[PDB]
C-alpha cells in the first residue's frame, strides 16, 4: 500500500516535496511518470498510468508548486 493513482493529491504533494526545484509546466506526463514510478513509496500499478491519472497528478503539482 503506497502512493495510489487515485490519491493524486498525496502524490502531487510528494512530487512538490521532493522536487520543489522543478516547474510542473515543463514537466510532461512522461517525465512525471518516470519520477513517480521511481518513488520508493509508490506502490499501486506501474502500468495503469492512464493519461488523466498522470494529468491529475500534474495538475495538483501545478496547484501546489504555484
Please name the method used to determine this structure.
Answer: NMR
Alpha-carbon gap, residue 30 to 36, rounded angstroms: 10
Which residues, in sequence order, are bridge partners of residue 42?
Answer: 3
Topology of 1-66 in CATH?
Arc Repressor Mutant, subunit A (1.10.10)
Is the distance from CB of 23 to CB of 15 less than 8 angstroms? no
Domain boundaries, the chain: 1-66
Distances, alpha carbon 20 to alpha carbons 1, 9, 25, 46, 47, in Å = 25, 15, 12, 23, 26
Amino acid at each position: 500500500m503506497g502512493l495510489k493513482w487515485t490519491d493524486s493529491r498525496e502524490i502531487g504533494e510528494a512530487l512538490y516535496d521532493a522536487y520543489p526545484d522543478l516547474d510542473p509546466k515543463t514537466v510532461r506526463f512522461t517525465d512525471m511518470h518516470q519520477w513517480i514510478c521511481d518513488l520508493e513509496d509508490f506502490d499501486d500499478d506501474p502500468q495503469a498510468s492512464n493519461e488523466k491519472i498522470l494529468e491529475a497528478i500534474l495538475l495538483v503539482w501545478l496547484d501546489e508548486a504555484e
